[model samples]
Target chain A: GPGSMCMAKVVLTKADGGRVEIGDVLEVRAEGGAVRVTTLFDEEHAFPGLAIGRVDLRSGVISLIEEQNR
Target chain B: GPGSMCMAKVVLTKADGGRVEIGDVLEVRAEGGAVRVTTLFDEEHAFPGLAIGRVDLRSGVISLIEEQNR
Candidate 1:
């Protein structure tokens, strides 16, 4: 409500090939200082058990640290 | 096939905005493990000259590691 954010893409998979899913909810989180993209897809993109980056399927959320102030 | 892995985006820049280029050919590497996107803007999006994240432009490549077991 007081900050700005955008969409970002997050990769969720192991170092090797096993299982993969594509997400597209993507969100940019801004608290007070700055904002950054935390995920690739939004809840709509979620498919029951999908993961992105370090985020897990249960979490259903990701946090991205702002790189700069825009 | 037996293991799992994922790639996570690692901000490469020094939080400083310089000359930024775009690269394609994004790849996902896996070895008896899970699969995840390791880079953004795959090869198709890559140009003969551009850079992705912290990865050096001269080094053309982004690694999206796995996040969890999915």
Candidate 2:
């Protein structure tokens, strides 16, 4: 958990001529999606972000990130 | 989607005679759980971190954050 990079998949795609697919891989930096060049992939990689919601936290000390592809 | 806060719940607790429970509330900051006092709760508050795994990232932008309660 120290100085790590995050990962995710392409659930959706809005890129024009995007090399990313609906199931492409994404890796994010510790700085999150706001930073650039944090992740690497097998496709047109972009900023990997977990579009998190608040409701999950109410459950506690357990849960899960995925990506919104290039 | 703009400098937003995060949330989670009390699924587990190791506090000494803890007031925390298995379904209590948790709210995290943009900085994540590394910082102190980044979250608020219906009970004892602490750093809320999602013990994320890399396997999920191969899929893309979605996720969670929870607390290993107070």
Candidate 3:
């Protein structure tokens, strides 16, 4: 099948504190209790499942939709 | 800071069977020995480290760049 190669600029929150600007082009996937974030640059990060409360594909926003106490 | 939002259409290959079409807007992250692929629809799949050989963000293609024998 054909493929679409559009990049999504994203900022992913870390499970503990702070977030990383993955700029453009990142992949998101679900894990046991966390959400994995990866980039074409070989960068990767994970956030708590609860923290990823939202993923606005149309708006191109995959934020740490929720926060947890540290 | 401001953010950029864009959606990426991708097709993710499973370890054993065929692949799934994640029409548009999927997230990717790297795991221990696998690459996690997720979609806005809450769909997820994992491709082995050797299976994911390419991710063409410009063309919006995240393929099972490589394949392994069963």
Candidate 4:
């Protein structure tokens, strides 16, 4: 029972896309651990074109991209 | 080693920019298994810009992107 990548959770979508919004504490640090992908704001349009968080308007559209390896 | 950050590496910059290189097995997976990141070549002018993996001019750069979370 030693499986973990920080549990992965964060999903969101709003701005007249309709129905999809969940934002679970959004936090992701890669290299070895830290992932919290359970988020919501409109229900993530039920995972259509799903991107956890990119959020960049000053880093705020929230589509998501964080990585560390190699 | 509960400090888990997977020994972060992957520092590269080329195309007339002095020098800088480091890529040690790049890998990251969220829901429980898979992680390996390390790659290289083109020791040109070296160390210009940095992007762990995202070499896509028709997906050639191999930058890296993957996710599976609901």
Which candidate tops lDDT? 3
Clashing pairs in 3: A4-B60, A5-B59, A5-B60, A5-B61, A6-B60, A27-B27, A27-B28, A28-B27, A28-B28
- Candidate 2 lDDT over A1-70, as tens digits, reads 2233323223322334333333323442323532122235344434345432222233221111333443
**Could you give candidate 1's per-residue lDDT for residues B1-70 as a string of tens digits?**
3333222332222224433332332342222133333234333222221122221112222323222224
> Chain B, model 4, TM-score against the native?
0.20
Q: lDDT per residue, candidate 1, A25-64, as tens digits?
A: 4442222333223333224322222222133222223322
Per-prediction DockQ comes to 0.03, 0.14, 0.08, 0.05
Q: Each model: TM-score of chain B?
A: 0.19, 0.20, 0.50, 0.20
lDDT of 2 by residue, B4-50 (tens): 32332233223353433333234332334422222353444343454
Cα-based TM-score, every candidate: 0.19, 0.22, 0.38, 0.22
Question: Per-residue lDDT for A1-70 in model 4, tens only?
Answer: 2431221233344446654333342232222133223232322223322322222212122233333323
Top-scoring candidate (DockQ):
2
- CAPRI grade, predicted model 2: incorrect
lDDT for position B50 in model 1: 18
Q: Cα-based RMSD of the predictions, in order?
A: 16.4, 13.9, 9.9, 14.6
What is the TM-score of candidate 1? Answer: 0.19
